[PDB]
Amino acid sequence: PSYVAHLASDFGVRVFQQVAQASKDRNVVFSPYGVASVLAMLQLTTGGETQQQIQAAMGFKIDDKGMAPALRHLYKELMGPWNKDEISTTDAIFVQRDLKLVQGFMPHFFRLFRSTVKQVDFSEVERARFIINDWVKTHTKGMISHLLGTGAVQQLTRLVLVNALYFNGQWKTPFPDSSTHRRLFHKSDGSTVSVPMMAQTNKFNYTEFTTPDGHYYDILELPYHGDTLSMFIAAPYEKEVPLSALTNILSAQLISHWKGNMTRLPRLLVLPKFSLETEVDLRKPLENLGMTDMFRQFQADFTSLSDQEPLHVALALQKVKIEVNESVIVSARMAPEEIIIDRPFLFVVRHNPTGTVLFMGQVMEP
Ligand SMILES: O=C(O)c1cc(O)c(O)c(O)c1
Numbered sequence: 011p012s013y014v015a016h017l018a019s020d021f022g023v024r025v026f027q028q029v030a031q032a033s034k035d036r037n038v039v040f041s042p043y044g045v046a047s048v049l050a051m052l053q054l055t056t057g058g059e060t061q062q063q064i065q066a067a068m069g070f071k072i073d074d075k076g077m078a079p080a081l082r083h084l085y086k087e088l089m090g091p092w093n094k095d096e097i098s099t100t101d102a103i104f105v106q107r108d109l110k111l112v113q114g115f116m117p118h119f120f121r122l123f124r125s126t127v128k129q130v131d132f133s134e135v136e137r138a139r140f141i142i143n144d145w146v147k148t149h150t151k152g153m154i155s156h157l158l159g160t161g162a163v164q165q166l167t168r169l170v171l172v173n174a175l176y177f178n179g180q181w182k183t184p185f186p187d188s189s190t191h192r193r194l195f196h197k198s199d200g201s202t203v204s205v206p207m208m209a210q211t212n213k214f215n216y217t218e219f220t221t222p223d224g225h226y227y228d229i230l231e232l233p234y235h236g237d238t239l240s241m242f243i244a245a246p247y248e249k250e251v252p253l254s255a256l257t258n259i260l261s262a263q264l265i266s267h268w269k270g271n272m273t274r275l276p277r278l279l280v281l282p283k284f285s286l287e288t289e290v291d292l293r294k295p296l297e298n299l300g301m302t303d304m305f306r307q308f309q310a311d312f313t314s315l316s317d318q319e320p321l322h323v324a325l326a327l328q329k330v331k332i333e334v335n336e337s338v339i340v341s342a343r344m345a346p347e348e349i350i351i352d353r354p355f356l357f358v359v360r361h362n363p364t365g366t367v368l369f370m371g372q373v374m375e376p
Pocket residue numbers: 047085099100101102123124125149
């Protein structure tokens with residue numbers, strides 16, 4: 011029954027692979043969970059071939075027994091009392107106000123998701139961008155408030171989807187503030203830059219990992235408070251190893267494979283702070299997974315939502331912000347060995363009780 015979290019996580023991972031491919035040495039943060047969530051919602055508005063494509067890529071039909079309840083249960087678990095403003099997430103779909111909608115579709119949307127498709131009059135362009143940005147502002151407790159991509163909303167815009175998340179976790183064990191210091195970080199083009207790094211020593215759940223194609227990485231787990239979430243960090247051990255070899259095989263099963271081989275060893279960990287924001291225009295990544303009809307103004311099929319339509323998605327966005335920070339004279343217990351994360355690495359944030367992949371990223375330069 012944690013089955014939908016797996017499928018939703020894997021779909022969102024494949025979307026992240028496509029976006030990583032398009033940004034070679036650029037920082038990127040992303041939510042596998044968020045894109046699956048907004049796309050599971052989009053599913054209900056579609057019919058015919060557009061629907062087939064999305065169900066093929068996602069691996070499940072939203073209408074199917076127990077799929078939506080499960081998603082709902084997961085969202086409610088994410089927003090529960092454990093979460094001290096650590097995570098905000100919002101999904102939304104905006105359709106043009108005028109439209110003759112399919113009878114009984116809006117309520118049925120409400121039954122399955124407990125939220126509504128919004129109606130905006132897109133002919134008041136200036137008003138329509140404000141409404142969208144303010145939605146995202148009000149549902150992320152003000153942490154996210156502008157989407158660049160809304161610059162593209164025009165008079166002819168009829169359907170827009172949006173997803174936004176902010177993450178900033180409390181560590182189970184906080185890094186000591188006095189330990190933070192400037193350290194050399196090696197960038198992928200060979201140059202260096204000085205950056206703040208945190209240090210902590212204790213028993214870290216650790217394993218070495220080899221991809222089937224012979225690429226090596228160090229894998230660390232960092233538990234957040236109460237063990238609800240964890241960050242997995244994956245970093246090459248030499249400088250010429252690409253993150254892609256790892257990213258291109260990434261899955262939920264892959265994390266649980268890490269977890270099964272890990273062991274808690276005493277280590278000094280030195281890790282850069284970072285606060286990163288990414289805005290993704292989802293159309294290429296999604297077309298790349300075969301969801302091409304939805305974006306084409308005649309091939310597109312949203313007849314589950316409206317028959318009075320040429321209806322198609324004019325804008326699909328994800329925006330994400332993630333912060334990893336800590337929460338004189340300076341002392342520590344010595345450890346048999348040191349793990350210095352001074353080269354590009356990937357990270358995964360997971361929801362431990364379901365296995366959901368809430369966030370992933372490659373940090374090329376912090
Ligand atoms: O359908 C969701 O899970 C969702 C619901 C909301 O009410 C919301 O504000 C959001 O940003 C996402």
